[PDB]
Amino acid sequence: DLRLHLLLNTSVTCNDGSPAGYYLKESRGSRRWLLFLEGGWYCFNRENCDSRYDTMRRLMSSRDWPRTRTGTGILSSQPEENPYWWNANMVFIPYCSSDVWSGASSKSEKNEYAFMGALIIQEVVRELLGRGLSGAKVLLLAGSSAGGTGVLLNVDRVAEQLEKLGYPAIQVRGLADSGWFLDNKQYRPTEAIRRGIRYWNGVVPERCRRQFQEGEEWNCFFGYKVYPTLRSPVFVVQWLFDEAQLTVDNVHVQEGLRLYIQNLGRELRHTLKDVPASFAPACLSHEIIIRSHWTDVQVKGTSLPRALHCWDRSLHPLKGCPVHLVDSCPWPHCNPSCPT
Numbered sequence: 021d022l023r024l025h026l027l028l029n030t031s032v033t034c035n036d037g038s039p040a041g042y043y044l045k046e047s048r049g050s051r052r053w054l055l056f057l058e059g060g061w062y063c064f065n066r067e068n069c070d071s072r073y074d075t076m077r078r079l080m081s082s083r084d085w086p087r088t089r090t091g092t093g094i095l096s097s098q099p100e101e102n103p104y105w106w107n108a109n110m111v112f113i114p115y116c117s118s119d120v121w122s123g124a125s126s127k128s129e130k131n132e133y134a135f136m137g138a139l140i141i142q143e144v145v146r147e148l149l150g151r152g153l154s155g156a157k158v159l160l161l162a163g164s165s166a167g168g169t170g171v172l173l174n175v176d177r178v179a180e181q182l183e184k185l186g187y188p189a190i191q192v193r194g195l196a197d198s199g200w201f202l203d204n205k206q207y208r209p210t211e212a213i214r215r216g217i218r219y220w221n222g223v224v225p226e227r228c229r230r231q232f233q234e235g236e237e238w239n240c241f242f243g244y245k246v247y248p249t250l251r252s253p254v255f256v257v258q259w260l261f262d263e264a265q266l267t268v269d270n271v272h273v274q275e276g277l278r279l280y281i282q283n284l285g286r287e288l289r290h291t292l293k294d295v296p297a298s299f300a301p302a303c304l305s306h307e308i309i310i311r312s313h314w315t316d317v318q319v320k321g322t323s324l325p326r327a328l329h330c331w332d333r334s335l336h337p338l339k340g341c342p343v344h345l346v347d348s349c350p351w352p353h354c355n356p357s358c359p360t
């Protein structure tokens with residue numbers, strides 16, 4: 021089990037001003053550290069954040085968090101369940117800022133809620149350095165859904181933070197699961213992110229900000245636009261027919277919809293052509309890395325735990341150990357190993 025620690029700096033808060041925190045299981049025989057960012061949509065104005073506070077309060081507050089959580093999937097410590105990193109130090113960072121991990125704004129006389137996702141990540145890293153992260157060789161910042169987008173927005177800031185604090189030997193890497201979205205034409209929008217950034221005081225990576233400039237930082241929330249600007253190594257996991265993508269596209273089969281779905285898969289495939297570390301199966305699903313049966317899906321005969329191990333070796337092409345795995349077949353479940 022992973023044990024809850026609320027942040028000692030109580031000014032780094034969830035939406036309602038309660039302290040943020042993290043769940044930790046140490047592995048004293050390991051110099052590898054996995055920090056995982058939870059997902060769960062977002063909110064972007066007073067009215068829809070108020071609604072989220074009524075029926076999704078654990079995503080806005082630490083007041084009701086449990087003292088422990090069980091690690092699953094890539095967060096499991098059993099080799100049978102996690103062939104990749106079962107002996108690592110494990111950290112689960114709850115998502116309680118509703119800002120895709122981008123915010124840097126405190127609650128105040130003018131702000132009903134605090135949006136501090138970017139600061140929560142920095143403070144967790146700071147406090148872990150006294151609990152053994154100072155001796156790490158690799159820090160893998162991972163996340164699913166909104167947490168996968170959060171990896172893309174924050175991995176280079178973690179790398180800069182550790183450099184400026186005096187830890188140049190820690191290698192920072194990212195693993196973004198189900199957070200690679202397309203700003204495509206709907207079957208039947210980006211305004212939500214633009215409004216959110218202003219409501220959250222949201223921050224994006226500096227090189228991407230300099231490309232798109234003021235008023236256009238929403239572009240940096242889209243993987244295919246922010247990824248080329250990043251310096252840390254990043255592995256991208258993305259279903260070709262992601263259910264959250266299709267929901268925003270207003271898709272729930274005749275010729276028009278057939279062509280729409282086939283075009284979505286082809287566009288997703290295209291955006292990953294120049295991403296050398298990636299895993300993109302032709303399935304209709306959403307998230308993968310913390311579910312218990314994450315080992316089952318394969319692309320071209322290679323599972324995701326194997327592909328991640330091959331990535332580790334590459335950062336020391338490899339014979340029989342591939343790291344770029346993108347399906348080419350054009351319809352959901354044309355890969356027999358898709359989850360049911």
Ligand SMILES: *[C@@H]1O[C@H](CO)[C@@H](O)[C@H](O)[C@H]1NC(C)=O
Pocket residue numbers: 029031032139
């Ligand atoms: C707590 O975090 C805030 C926001 O990052 C920072 O301004 C403040 O200095 C921190 N407190 C301490 C004691 O470091």
Ligand SMILES: CC(=O)Nc1ccc2nsnc2c1
Pocket residue numbers: 061120165166169201213241242264268
């Ligand atoms: C349901 C939903 O809309 N999820 C998300 C989360 C983060 C995003 N960043 S860009 N588009 C995104 C969409």
Ligand SMILES: CC(=O)Nc1ccc2nsnc2c1
Pocket residue numbers: 201202203204205206209210211264265268269
């Ligand atoms: C024009 C536009 O904004 N299109 C879309 C479509 C699906 C999305 N999923 S997340 N952000 C999305 C944006």
